[PDB]
Every structure is written in C-alpha cells, then in structure tokens.
Design a protein around this ligand. Structure first.
Ligand SMILES: NC(=O)C1=CN([C@@H]2O[C@H](COP(=O)(O)OP(=O)(O)OC[C@H]3O[C@@H](n4cnc5c(N)ncnc54)[C@H](OP(=O)(O)O)[C@@H]3O)[C@@H](O)[C@H]2O)C=CC1
Ligand SMILES: NC(=O)C1=CN([C@@H]2O[C@H](COP(=O)(O)OP(=O)(O)OC[C@H]3O[C@@H](n4cnc5c(N)ncnc54)[C@H](OP(=O)(O)O)[C@@H]3O)[C@@H](O)[C@H]2O)C=CC1
Ligand SMILES: NC(=O)C1=CN([C@@H]2O[C@H](COP(=O)(O)OP(=O)(O)OC[C@H]3O[C@@H](n4cnc5c(N)ncnc54)[C@H](OP(=O)(O)O)[C@@H]3O)[C@@H](O)[C@H]2O)C=CC1
Ligand SMILES: NC(=O)C1=CN([C@@H]2O[C@H](COP(=O)(O)OP(=O)(O)OC[C@H]3O[C@@H](n4cnc5c(N)ncnc54)[C@H](OP(=O)(O)O)[C@@H]3O)[C@@H](O)[C@H]2O)C=CC1
Ligand SMILES: [Cl-]
Ligand SMILES: [Cl-]
Ligand SMILES: [Cl-]
Ligand SMILES: [Cl-]
Ligand SMILES: [Cl-]
Ligand SMILES: [Cl-]
Ligand code: NA
Ligand code: NA
Ligand code: NA
Ligand code: NA
Lengths: 312, 293, 293, 312
C-alpha cells in the first residue's frame, strides 16, 4: 500500500505522514511538496524513519514533487493549502487551483486511486477534487465533520467524566458554522445521551459553539490544528486500506441517498472500505436535524457553485 | 500516572506530549511552558485532546507554568531549550536549574528524562540541582543515534544495534552488540554524527524521532517493563571504575528508573573509545556546573 | 499492579489469569487455590509464562494458598466455587467468607471482583465479610448476559446493549438503551437466560466469555478508564431509592472501583421489572447472610 | 480468512480457537471434532462468541465434523491427538492414523491450504501430514521447537529480570530430548547473551533440562500445556495470513538448505508468509551446535521411518 501526502512539509501533512507510516497496512508513505521544498522533506524523511526505528515499524519513506511520484498511490491525502485582507472566497479559489494542479486527470493514469481532501473549505474542495480528477464518486472523500465530531466527543466525555471511546456522537453537514449535531445518534456507553443523568446540565448550544470556533481558536493560539486531523486522517486511511467497512462521518458526494439531496459533497455518514465510499447510510434525523441539514447543503452548494465558476 | 512535559510548545515537546498521552499508562499529561506561551498551550491541549478522541484514547491534559503544576508528576520530561556551544550549554543549564532545582524536596519519587542538548551534560546538571537519587534522572542521548544507525544497517525491525558514549562527536558504535545473529561502517558513523545537524538545516530539527523515543522510555518506566535501553545515566563505577559522570550507557529501566547499569563487554578498541568520550563529557560537565554556580 | 485470582485452577480462573497477565497494566498475577491444588498451579504458572513469551508480554506469576499471598493485591478476582441452589449459595458464601473476611483490615484499598455464582448475592457477602468500602466490591453478572444478548442482535461490534438486574431469571433487558441509533425479543431473552445452563451441559461451563469480561473489568479499573459498565454493585438509593442490595446496574468504573451508580432512565415496564429483580436478590441475600452467621 | 481447528474440543484446540478468533486477520474459525463431540463444540462456540462480544471483535464461529467443513480453510490447525502401557511408537501410530484420516488428499480439493500440525510427535507427524495430504512442501509446518524456544526465553528473561520481549533465543532440532539450543543466536536486548553480565551465573544445562522436561512436568501437574501452545499457534497463523514474512522456528521439510540435510521435518528457522514456508534460512551454527543437530535429525528420521512403515 502506498499513501502519498501532498503538502507533507505542512503542519498537518507532516504529522499525518508520520502517523500514517506507523500503520501496518501502509507500506510506503510518499512525501510530496513543491520542488523548492523538497530539501525540507529530506529532513522530515530522516526524522520519520527514525521514529519508525524507535517504534520498530517497517515502512518506506519516499520523497517526490511531480505527478509520477504520487499518481500511482493507493491513497492520496491532500493537505496542501495556502495560509490565512483575504475573504473566504479568495482562499477557496487559491486552494482550488492547488487541487486542480495536483489532482486533475489522475483517473486517466490511476482510476483506482482514493483521494482524501483535507484542505479547507473541505466540503467545496472535496467536490472540486472529484470533478478535476474524473475519479468515480466513491473514490474521493474529505475529512469534513469527522474532526468536528471528535471535538464534540471530547466535550461530552469530559462532562460525564468517561473514557473518550465510550462516547459515540455524529455531526453532519458543512465543516463550518452550518454543522448539524445529531443528538439522536449520540450516546455514552451505548446509552442514548438523552437518557443520561447529567445531559440536562450539559449546555449543548455552548458545546456546539466551541466546536464551530475550535478551528479558529486553535489557529489563533497554537497556530493550527495538527495532531487532531493527523490522527483523524490516519484512521480514515486505515479504514480504507484494511477494508474495515465501517461507517464514519466524512464529506462525500451525495446522490439521493439522504432526503434525495444530490450534486453536493458534504459531511455525511458513509461506510468506507478498500473501494472507498461503499454506501451513504440513511439516518433517522429528527425534524429540526433534517431542517438544519437542508440549510447546510444550501450553503455548501452555493459556495461550490462560486468555486467551480472560478476554476473555469 | 502523570507525565509533565516542560517545553510542550516546542517541536519535540508538543509531539512528545501528543504521543505520550496516547499511552494507556499515561492518565494525565501536564503541558508546561513559559508564562508568555500559555496561549500556545491552550491550543495544543485542545488539539491533543482531539487526537485522543480520534485514537479512542484518553488522558486528562492540563497546562501550567509554575512548580506546583508539575512537581507532583511521576515523570518529568525536559525538552525546554533555547534555539557558541558553551553559551548554549550555560543557558540551557540555567533552564534545567530554574525548573528542577530542589524537586527531590517536594517529590522524592519523581523521575526526570532530560532531552535538552547537551543531554549528557544537562542530565548531570538536572541530577545535582534536583537532588533526586542517581537512578531517577536519565537522558535521551545515544539511543536516538542508535535508531538512525539501525536505519542504515536495516537498508544494507530485526536489526538491533547499540551506541554508547556522548550524544555527539565522541559516540561509540558498539559493533560487538549489533545483531540482525551478530554482525563502510566508518561512513555510516559519520552520517549518524551529522544526522542531527542535517535535519536541523532541512526540517528545522528532529521531532517524531525523539518524540517516539521519549514515548518508549516513559512507557518502559511507568509499566515497569525492565528493558535494557541506552540512556544517559550517572555512573558510579559500573564500567571500568568510571564514576561521577552522566553518559550514554546500557541500563535496565523500570518503574524505579535506572535499575542497574548493565556492564556490557566491550572490545579493546570500543572500550578505549568510551574512555575518550567520558573525558569530553566530564570536562563539558564541569564547565556547565561552574557556570550554574 | 498485582491481581490475585482465587480459584485459578478452575475453568474460568485459569483462563482469566492467562488473559489478565497479558495486560500491560497487570505486572503480577498471583494464582491462589486450595492447598491440595498447588501442583496444578505450578503447571499453570509455567504454561501462562510460556504464553506471555509467545505474546511478547510479561508478568510475574506467583502462587499461593494463604491470606498473605493475595491480601496485598490491588484487585482480587474471586472465581472459587464448588461444582440444591440454596445449598450452593451457602457453600459458596462460606468460601467468600473464608477468603475475604477482614481484607479491609490489612488492605483497605483493595478491590474485589466476584465471579462466583450467585454473583449478586455473593457480591453482597464479599462486601460485608471484607469490610471494604461499598465502591470497592463488584461482581460480574448481567454484563456477560449483555454479551450473549449482543450476539443475537448482532446477527439479526457496533451493537451496544445493556441488561440490568439479577444474573438469573429476573434479569431486565434494557431495550431503552440498546442502539446499533437506538433500536422475537421475548425469545432472544429466553435464550440468554438459558445460555449459561446450555453451555454447562455441552462444554461444561463458560470460560472464555467470562475470562475476557473479567480482563476488561480489571483493565478498566487498573488504568482508571472510567467506563460505564454493568456490574453487580451495592445500591444506596441511586435508583428508585433502592438501598442495601448488590445487583447488576450501570456504573462508572475506575481505579477507585465504583465511581458512581449511573441512574439510567428506565421505562415504566423496565423499572417495574427491576423492582421485581431487586426483591428476589434481596431475599436470596438475606438467606445467604443468615447461613454465614 | 478461514482457520479450521481440528480437535477444538481439546485443551489446546479450544484455547487456540478462542485466541485465533480474536485475530483481525481471521474472519472465520471452524471448530472441528468427531461427530459425537459436536454437541460439545456448540457450547464452546457460544462461549467463544461471548468472548468476541466482550472484546468487540468480529468473527464467524462455525462447527463441523467432515472433510467438507474444513478442507476449504486457508489454515488447518491439527490439535487432535490421543491421550497418554503405551510406548512412544504406539502413540505415534495412533496419532498418525488421525492425521491420515483428516488430512489425506486435502491437496486435491484445496491445493492452496496450509496445515499447522500440533499433535505430538510434531516432527514425525508434520512429515506424515505432508505426504498424506500431497500438499507442497512449504504449505505444511509443525509447532516444533517454537514452544521450546518460548520456554527457554522465559528462563533467560527471569534470570536477567528483563521483559520477555527483550530476549530472542532459538532452539532447533526435535521437539524432544534432542533439541539444540542455539546460544550463538540468543540475545538479551540486542546484546549477544555471551557478552551479558550474568551469563556466567546462568546454568544453561539446567535451563535446557527444564525446557526438555517442561512438557511432561506440565502434564503431570496442570494436565497439559494450553495457553502456551494456544498463543504460539495464534502467532504462527497471524504471521501466515498477514504475510509478515518473518523468521520463526518451526518444524518444516528440509530440502538441503542446511548442511545438505534432506527428507525430514524438524524444527528449523523458516520465513513464513501467506504462501507458507517462503524459505529455510541457513544459520551459522557452531561446531557443537551443528553436531548436536545432526544427532537430532538422525533420531527424527528414524522415528519418521518407523511411523511411515506403520501407516502403510
Ligand atoms: N478539519 C480539516 O479539514 C482541517 C483542515 N486543514 C486544512 O489543511 C491545509 C493544511 O493546513 P496546515 O498544514 O496547517 O498549513 P501549513 O501552512 O502549515 O502547510 C501548508 C502546506 O501546503 C503547502 N503549500 C502552500 N501553498 C502551496 C501552493 N501554492 N502550492 C503547493 N503547495 C502549497 C506547503 O508547502 P510549502 O513548504 O511549499 O509552503 C505546506 O506543505 C489547510 O488548507 C487547512 O485549512 C487543516 C487542519 C484541519
Ligand atoms: N536529546 C535529543 O536527542 C534531542 C535533543 N533535543 C533538544 O531538546 C530541546 C528542544 O528542541 P526543540 O523542541 O526542537 O526546540 P524548539 O525551539 O522548537 O522548542 C524549545 C522549547 O523550549 C522552550 N524554551 C525556549 N527557550 C526557553 C527558555 N529560555 N526558558 C524556558 N523555556 C524555553 C520553548 O518555549 P517557548 O514557546 O516559550 O519558546 C519551547 O517549548 C533543544 O535543547 C534540543 O537541542 C531535541 C531533539 C532531540
Ligand atoms: N459470574 C459469571 O458470569 C460466571 C460465574 N461463574 C462462577 O464462577 C465459579 C467458577 O466456575 P468454574 O471455574 O467453571 O468452576 P470449576 O469447578 O471449573 O472451578 C472451581 C474453582 O474453585 C475452586 N474450588 C472449588 N471448590 C472449592 C472450595 N470448596 N473451596 C475453595 N475453592 C474451591 C477449584 O479449585 P480445586 O482445583 O481445588 O477444585 C477451582 O479453582 C463458579 O461458582 C461459577 O458458577 C463461572 C462462569 C461465569
Ligand atoms: N508443543 C507442541 O507441539 C504441543 C503438542 N500438543 C499435542 O497436541 C495434541 C492435543 O493435546 P490436548 O489438547 O492437550 O489433548 P486433549 O486430550 O485435551 O484433547 C484431544 C483432542 O483430540 C480429539 N481426539 C482424541 N482422540 C481422537 C481420535 N481418535 N480421533 C479424532 N479426534 C480425537 C479430542 O476430541 P474428543 O472430544 O472427541 O475426545 C480432542 O479434541 C496432543 O497430541 C498433544 O501431544 C499439545 C500441546 C503442545
Ligand atoms: Cl479545523
Ligand atoms: Cl505525532
Ligand atoms: Cl538530535
Ligand atoms: Cl485463553
Ligand atoms: Cl454464566
Ligand atoms: Cl509440549
Ligand atoms: Na508501515
Ligand atoms: Na492515556
Ligand atoms: Na502483564
Ligand atoms: Na476475527
């Protein structure tokens, strides 16, 4: 198995690459960056190889900077993105240009490649990546609200003082201010969270507000999320390369599987396997949850239209 | 168990804290940094917690700057270090003292893992200023050099090697204990000695290499695994009657720290090289201690 | 951490000890049995050690028969039990007393996990004879029934269920907290109630089921995982003002044992069924305590 | 992946099956026993399924009692054997009859099946299994001195008070009184054991004597090894189904890879993968070690000749 990380010189890309190289299912991690930055990857390669020696894990760490260095990869993780007088539309256009530059026409050379988009806006860029690459709709996904769900899982776990793995929550919709917390599918130790003593003392709105602002708050303090998305990326890649066929919230192309919504890449629960999105599970969203989703799909569709019009 | 990471805002500190928190034996990680770096720690704490949730792991992450925030830790990992060589040792030595002077008085059962370079010298400084027992203060030195040396031989998991002496130009590759079945070696050595500087000039400094090594050392301690690992430890005559020096040696590491310095049988040429290394480390150690006075 | 397994020569005891020793948090397992069974323990110790080496795990395995061999353990797992139902409870109750009477006096911070059936009654006996705090004595009861119930629904890993009440004919399947997303149920229940007896008449008795469950409970305790697990615990009015009874309930389990009995919201029919179960357990508990006097 | 355990009703077979079912690479464990014992496997199946529910591991547990219930398995573990006025030759003949009864002609129906023989004499019966089954020489192995090496590893670890995984030793030859401890390949923490302070205070002969007698001592006390071989079986199966390509002491067919020895199944270091024995690594045995091996191959060849003459 070959996993190429586009933008490995970056905060998320470097950490994702290091953790990805520890997975037993990953046999090669290719570090990809711009030509002038290849020298920076040489230092990262040696550093990761040292970490693998300490963990007694085997993995080949290669470096590249062209299409032929990663197009043949089983999974391509897109972590390249411009840093933050710039509106959200300008960032989307610049980052979209990077998506096209790297992923355009990948299907012609590798029709069986899976692309995991991390660059923000992940929902919009996940759609851009799918169209420029020409790959099937199930072989392109984005981190989406996967990380948002983990952040919401932290708050729930700490409130009940339970192990983090005891909480299972789910946030769908955009990776932004229109995300939709699915409380109906949130549980603590298999128990519906609504039936948990303490839920009444849990300020959902406040918690949901922290998750929405967590991305910006981390950038303003630490400089940007790093280990969170690195580990989330590792988990998604492991689920794919090992064909675990498990449902995970990711940004995927909708084709009428939920409320007949179509032609949009947004965060939804999808069963992931070696062949990508094996299916988009229909959820029993409540009235308010379904409404909030619709508003989220409208925002993503609008932003996606503006992004595609600019890539033209 | 509680692990404090002094210097958590740094390249190695931040990565070490993230990987330490994953360990099931580490129930709490305390991120310690200078007062002006509290904000960075608030963000790092949030990001580490997110990574634990993704990994199905758990750890209470706390932050602090004062002594009472980390003196009660079971393991204190020292990664704080400023960005001539003697001045660097002096400044770094003053950081060790400001953070660890008198830890034994408040927590006699604390263990310290020094990462700051020169690790061999600063391991000795941390022991003296803290007053802890000689078995409870170790440094991460030639162990990381052994990993880089393993990579090269692995190219030419089941390659096991060992390097002793200073974490610098006087390191002693122990070929007598390098088995893949026991085994340009001079070239490969020169590559390991320059591996650190070459990573600094490219990536900016080692990160995941030492982070994973720190994780392994802490796990070996907290779970009392009693593994024979190369660490910078105080010598009291276990090898060639050499005493009063902290340098990279094979030691059996467990919950009580250095359980015993394993007197590995070294060849004639390897033993002479270890004597030369001890001389350099002792000299540098004296200069650092004198400046701390 | 040290885990003692009283009854290690038995089907469940031997398997539990083998799987407990694998845990990285279990540094020592003490195999305890009757004096005439020391030989069996010497062989079992040798075989368990061999399994650890094959697994790349480690644990000091010790053997004993007297109190001083296991009273200093962090967790004491009680699997000793003879092969009418009232006589069995009385005999088993006398074993609990002979082994645990007065443990709190010598080790007040000990935790007991009762496996011997009737676990709900014997969990109460072990608490009273030992004198330990009510949060440090738990039993493995309806948890194993939840696992068998999960299998059936899993057929019709991501099926999570919960059964409360007695580990017997008065168990309360909590459908209100059974999510795969929340959910012949009467048939599936009857299968779980007879699952134990059907395994006894075929294989001779459950073994790997309870062994793995014991392992999970001990690991949850020793690593302070704070997981919401169904265990037989003393009630002091947390659910419907029910007090003075040990019965299967959802509890948050950590290093201090039962950290809190989680008052799960039960439906009307589910709450009435739990009241009926408590009555049976209380009655049986009184008869067992009276015989121990 | 399907792993069939012939003799799952037994001490080793039941425990091996339970642990094998926990491996992620094992998707189905088939419990095989004599027809009258199938009812006993029904209880074991439920018990193992419960253990899998507790471990949150997925695996299908099936029961069978005929060739068609296990011949299509990827790995067949032979743990069936008669219990101990019986000489070693009589046991070998009876157990050999069980080998033929189960494994004869398996290659015709499944040429890509791997057989792991555990029944003693494992060295002799490993050879019997290979011939009656007609499978290739690399698709049939036996536990051999693998367990003996683990037992010797315990004694070394306890002597130096080190973690068991820090010791790497190797015992070759027969799984009996002719085993050969390879001290040249024994190490503690990567250090040659000969260069370890304390080796002079380690009574090798005594330790080697305990390992040789450990099998009988356990039978006389506990009733028979159980978790030791169960875990060793699990490790071998995992190495195969995951194609780890790692060297492990096992009883394999020699074909001139070591000292030109041929036509014998005895304990030797072999790299195991999805295709079985990928190769028999030549070892740098010392003079005494090579001599002791030769004596061991002579005993196994003689016992194997007597066993084949009786199966005729
Ligand atoms: N939940 C989520 O989906 C998350 C989203 N992200 C997104 O991931 C991306 C990476 O963030 P982060 O790693 O912190 O950013 P950094 O600025 O730390 O790294 C950016 C990376 O992109 C590369 N890069 C920058 N500009 C270009 C360009 N014009 N062409 C090619 N490569 C370029 C950089 O390489 P070089 O050395 O050449 O500059 C570097 O590897 C961002 O878009 C961010 O928004 C991040 C975390 C979480
Ligand atoms: N032993 C080994 O094998 C290795 C050695 N090291 C050593 O570890 C140290 C850390 O390296 P690295 O993380 O890459 O360096 P960075 O510069 O990236 O981080 C340094 C850390 O120390 C803190 N710090 C810096 N100056 C001071 C000071 N005067 N007083 C207190 N705290 C201070 C920083 O906090 P702030 O945000 O306030 O600046 C930060 O947390 C170095 O000394 C390095 O040589 C590193 C890698 C491996
Ligand atoms: N809670 C649950 O879900 C489960 C409950 N259990 C209960 O656990 C217990 C153990 O079951 P299992 O291991 O299958 O039974 P076994 O008969 O196989 O083992 C019984 C164990 O108890 C010892 N023992 C027996 N009688 C006495 C006595 N009078 N005094 C002291 N020790 C004694 C035996 O030692 P010796 O060699 O000396 O006979 C042996 O170690 C039983 O009471 C059983 O009901 C079991 C499975 C699951
Ligand atoms: N290092 C090694 O290689 C080791 C070797 N072994 C060997 O493994 C074998 C299993 O030992 P163990 O599990 O303790 O033995 P047990 O007596 O406990 O179990 C024997 C198994 O074989 C079955 N069996 C017995 N006789 C026959 C027969 N005539 N035809 C078919 N099946 C039969 C039994 O089923 P049923 O219920 O029908 O009787 C049962 O499943 C032995 O030959 C033993 O020597 C064991 C451990 C280690
Ligand atoms: Cl983010
Ligand atoms: Cl990391
Ligand atoms: Cl370095
Ligand atoms: Cl087991
Ligand atoms: Cl039961
Ligand atoms: Cl044996
Ligand atoms: Na790898
Ligand atoms: Na942890
Ligand atoms: Na252990
Ligand atoms: Na499985």
């Amino acid at each position: 198995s070959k996993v190429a990380v586009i933008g490995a010189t970056g905060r998320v890309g470097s950490t994702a690459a290091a953790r990805l190289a520890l997975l037993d299912c990953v046999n090669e991690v290719t570090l990809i960056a711009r030509p002038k930055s290849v020298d920076k990857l040489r230092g990262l390669r040696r550093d990761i190889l040292d970490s693998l020696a300490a963990a007694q894990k085997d993995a080949e760490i290669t470096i590249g900077c062209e299409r032929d260095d990663y197009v043949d990869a089983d999974v391509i993780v897109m972590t390249a993105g411009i840093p933050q007088g710039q509106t959200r539309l300008d960032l989307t256009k610049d980052n979209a240009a990077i998506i096209k530059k790297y992923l355009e026409g990948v299907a012609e050379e590798n029709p069986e490649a899976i692309v995991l988009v991390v660059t923000n806006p992940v929902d919009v860029l996940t759609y851009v990546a799918l169209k420029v690459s020409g790959l099937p709709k199930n072989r392109v996904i984005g981190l989406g609200t996967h990380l948002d769900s983990m952040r919401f899982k932290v708050l729930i776990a700490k409130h009940f003082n339970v192990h983090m793995s005891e909480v299972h929550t789910r946030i769908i919709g955009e990776h932004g201010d229109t995300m939709v917390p699915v409380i109906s599918s949130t549980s603590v130790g298999g128990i519906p969270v609504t039936r948990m003593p303490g839920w009444e003392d849990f300020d959902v709105e406040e918690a949901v507000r922290e998750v929405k602002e967590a991305g910006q708050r981390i950038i303003e303090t630490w400089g940007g999320s790093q280990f969170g998305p690195a580990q989330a990326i590792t988990n998604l890649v492991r689920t794919i390369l090992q064909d675990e066929r498990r449902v995970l919230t990711v940004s995927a192309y909708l084709d009428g599987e939920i409320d007949g919504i179509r032609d949009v890449c947004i965060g939804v629960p999808a069963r992931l396997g070696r062949e990508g999105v094996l299916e988009i599970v229909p959820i029993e969203l409540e009235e308010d949850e379904m409404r909030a989703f619709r508003r989220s799909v409208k925002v993503v569709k609008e932003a996606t239209r503006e992004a595609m019009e600019a890539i033209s």
